[model samples]
Target: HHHHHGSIMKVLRKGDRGDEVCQLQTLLNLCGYDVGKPDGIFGNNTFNQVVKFQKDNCLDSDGIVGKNTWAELFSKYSPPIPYKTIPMPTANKSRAAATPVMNAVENATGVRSQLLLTFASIESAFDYEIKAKTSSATGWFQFLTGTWKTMIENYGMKYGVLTDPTGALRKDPRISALMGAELIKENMNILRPVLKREPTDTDLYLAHFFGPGAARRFLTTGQNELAATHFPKEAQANPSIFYNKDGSPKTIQEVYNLMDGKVAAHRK
Candidate 1:
């Protein structure tokens, strides 16, 4: 039925299949991100191509074809600002500027500025204006459109970031830091029963990567499950995070260790 399925905002990820994936494939090709042939499968190749497109467009490079990615793909403006056009910060200067803002965010949200900086460094590298090169994640914490909406609903009023009339708040490191802190706090509370203990920063990072439910599962029995078995599509798109040198799925501990290692490196 050659209907306008593009108008439908179905978020697509790896491990999906069907005509919609096929349509997405064709559209990606037309836009020059080439996914080989439209085989109606959202496999590795398609995922990579989608990533390239997202990177070029400065969308979150998460590789998931969500609403923002879809909107960009079909926009009359088509390609807006290429990722290259975005200004790169003098690393030290931006990091210095963000320090005080994050300190304020920490005071407001009860999440440490150090922890917030760790997330921001990983998420946007102190570039508050940087959009994700793949998905809709943006600003200091790289929040996706949907996630941003929820954050506003939950903590906007209390933080006085209630309305981002010009979408300026997303680019405001202070506001983004505040929201990110709240998200971490909420996730830690949500994981309380599952952990039966205080969640470590690494644990909260895992929760941030997935969610409390999956993060808890990963900490428990999911440690033994294959990454592909635990979350096939995510594993497919993020092999390094999910698999080991032997090509076996990494245990939950292994994933935790990796994330912990990165955070430690950044801390130094």
Candidate 2:
């Protein structure tokens, strides 16, 4: 059927919750509509943004993110967002819990201090000991098996214990933290040329969440299409249970001052 959701499979209407809706809210804000919160609850505000987006894009305007709506939004409509995050305390429990993450940020290549710290904040919040079945990621930095393996094999060889890879990642927060910091550096190796300098924490974020291939697409084209163009065929065929679609990249006018172009220009 022509009615197919983008990288996500299910239909989203009013009253949905969790991660997919967070992605939707992010997209809506990028399109210049305010859903009031990126908290992932579908309500009047989010519904209004959906309606506006649909009406503007010549869709049904029913305020639902159904298959048809996903078809359009993922294609040409959605763009990206501003790089704004609240300051993190250097002395909070979240910060204290991520001591190794902070140390890793201080040591890794191609990552800024504030950005790395913030990424640490995002990954595990203030929880040094969180293990969820729902999250393939475990420990302070939430290391998935693949990421953990790569980190351990390379720069973090000393940390590797003779145990199951998955179990190792889930159990050790320090290893995960170090691996996460390295992850930012490795992704930036691909992104620096496109950005013409160090990539933003946001760029690292895109790589971490969307995978490097899609992150490159997001860098060059501003919108990443997760549909087989640059991604694994298996991923392309199925929508993520988290983010419904990929992303679009572009500049917004009001926050032009915050744009890299503007900031760079100002530095010169």
Candidate 3:
């Protein structure tokens, strides 16, 4: 009953029109098989782009938007593209400040800038100084103190960024950005093998929110279980994410659907 049709909709082809078509075109562009602006209309240009994408991805090049094509287009990984740091004229001051560091992080790691932006948007609303009321989770990506210490040890020392004795560096946008990128890369490395394919953005988010071990179980055999029952403490802290209005625990699929919709809504 959600707006996410790419995973469930049967097929799309030439002459199609509406939101799904627009989403298809956007995914094509994200995957570097450009189809111009997503005008909600599928024409010859879109059709040709579909064929090219299919051929490059080793799918049947029939110019049809089918399951394989749709899946590939939604994938988070893209071949390395040159990174450029441009001014965010329309962004607020906080976003503008973070853009340069995020650009450098993206250039160094292949993580998409949008994914990092999305995490910051949801975590702290671009507030690098924010701290969680319930826990020690702090900074832009909301790393806990233990995780911060570990990341500082693993990546911070190598990158020449240090956590001060007071751990005040967690609030410094540059240091936090580097540590956050390393955190994401670490989670992705753990998840890639478990997923048996490139981890989707939502999968990465799950690893970030739940840790890699629980995320694997949640994505695989535990998919149908109630999230609240599985992680009672996390559920208590994040009730909106774990429960419905009636207070019943959300199944893993339901949680994923909610996140999928949210991530799509926040896209630029």
Candidate 4:
């Protein structure tokens, strides 16, 4: 059977084994990306080859063969236009440009622009630095691997972005905005009924960090005691974001407010 059992919904990285991995190797060799051979396992050779392809094509070099990376591999590779050709700004341009995209996402997702913009500022310092950080969570909107997989595989593909989705998030501020906005929209879709009202930006933000399960728990904890048990383990996992100087466990609500100011500072 196909060990590449991981595709878009699951994703295929190193240590993944199956016919699909073999398929990926074969394609990489054909494209001249230099994969050694199809061994039915994604290993060092495959990772290196994927990295080279990502760099050469101006895509993210995280080296995980997820949707954006996969999209380019199977096809003739080409660089993604920043924001796929949105007018780019010069200095503070990336910041303002993403705002417009945020507005569009607001219309599309119903989350309101203020919350999204604040979130963007928190993620990128509003610089929209395409190569802002070496982490997978690059660009103004801070898209990580899972976020990239979802948008690139599902939404990005439907939008015809899967054709060449490399580096689009870090390259184009608008594309970055779209990635975050779409993710937020998606997370909101998971929260709307459970929340029974417009989700606060804090609620939306928490979902990105801990996911729908923990986010809903945090959301309902004020009403349901059982909700208190969900996010503690998750919060403890990212101490940088969830701990105080005294090592106190910051509640999800506290973290939410802190990040709001964190983003707000970038506006100045």
Candidate 1 Cα errors over 4 Å, as ranges: 1-93, 165-168, 222-225, 245-247
What TM-score, computed on C-alpha atoms, does each candidate reach? 0.60, 0.46, 0.60, 0.57
Against the true structure, whose lDDT is highest? 3
Model 4: lDDT of residue 64 = 72
Q: How do the residues 1-268 of candidate 2 rate in per-residue lDDT, one tens digit apiece?
A: 3243353435788988876686667656655777775887888889987998899888888887876676665454332210111122344345653454454445543345566556655666645456657656766566776666556534432232212434554554454444566677778887886787677766666677677776676566423232333444423433342123454322322112232332243121
Candidates 2 and 4, the one with greater lDDT:
4
lDDT tens per residue, model 4, 111-185? 577877777766666666534446677776777765675566444422335423355555456566666777887
Model 2, residue pairs in steric clash = 7-239, 94-126, 222-249, 223-248, 223-249
Which parts of model 2 have CA positions greater than 4 angstroms off? 1-93, 97-101, 108-111, 158-166, 222-268
lDDT of 3 at 53: 79
Displacement of residue 118 (Cα, Å) in model 2 is 1.1
What's the lDDT for all of these models? 0.71, 0.55, 0.72, 0.64
> Could you tell me which 10 consecutive residues in candidate 3 have the lowest summed lDDT?
81-90
Q: Residue 74 of model 3: what lDDT?
A: 50
Model 4 TM-score is: 0.57
| Alpha-carbon runs more than 4 Å astray in model 4 | 1-86, 90-94, 104-111, 130-134, 163-169, 223-229, 240-244, 250-268
How many backbone overlaps does candidate 1 show?
Answer: 9
Find the number of clashing residue pairs for candidate 2: 5
Deviation in angstroms for 111 in model 3? Answer: 2.4
Native-vs-model 3 lDDT? 0.72
